[PDB]
Amino acid sequence: SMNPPPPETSNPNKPKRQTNQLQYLLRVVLKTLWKHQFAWPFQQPVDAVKLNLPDYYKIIKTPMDMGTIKKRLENNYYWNAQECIQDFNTMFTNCYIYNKPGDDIVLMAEALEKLFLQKINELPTEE
Numbered sequence: 742s743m744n745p746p747p748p749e750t751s752n753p754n755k756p757k758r759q760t761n762q763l764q765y766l767l768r769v770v771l772k773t774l775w776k777h778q779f780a781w782p783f784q785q786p787v788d789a790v791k792l793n794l795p796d797y798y799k800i801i802k803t804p805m806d807m808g809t810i811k812k813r814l815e816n817n818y819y820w821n822a823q824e825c826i827q828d829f830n831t832m833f834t835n836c837y838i839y840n841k842p843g844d845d846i847v848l849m850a851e852a853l854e855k856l857f858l859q860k861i862n863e864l865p866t867e868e
């Protein structure tokens with residue numbers, strides 16, 4: 742029934758890098774998805790209290806959202822691009838796990854994911 746604490750976005754002892762791939766993940770990938778007309782349900786953690794989804798965090802054990810990803814990118818939280826790509830994929834997969842096909846939120850996730858895949862296809866080679 743209750744909400745968990747959000748995912749970690751700060752950890753001073755976690756090793757961090759700023760790489761050209763992570764810069765692309767923020768400037769191209771995150772920015773493109775964030776401005777999309779279907780971005781809004783994904784811009785913050787699922788509030789299972791407000792949304793009256795008391796089973797959400799009984800089913801979704803690795804929550805993820807673009808607000809968290811945005812903070813991780815802006816806080817230089819990641820070591821490599823694959824960590825960040827995994828967060829996006831967790832976010833989409835959580836939606837497909839919890840909801841049913843044809844739900845509005847699933848259609849929204851699919852449109853964002855299509856764009857995500859198109860941008861990741863042109864992830865630059867590591868400098």
Ligand SMILES: COc1cc2c(c(OC)c1OC)[C@H](c1cc(Br)ccc1F)CC(=O)N2
Binds near residue numbers: 787836849
């Ligand atoms: C990522 O998972 C979700 C995030 C949000 C919402 C979700 O409910 C479908 C949701 O799926 C569990 C809410 C919402 C979205 C649509 Br579309 C229709 C009804 C809604 F209650 C609103 C929101 O701000 N975020």
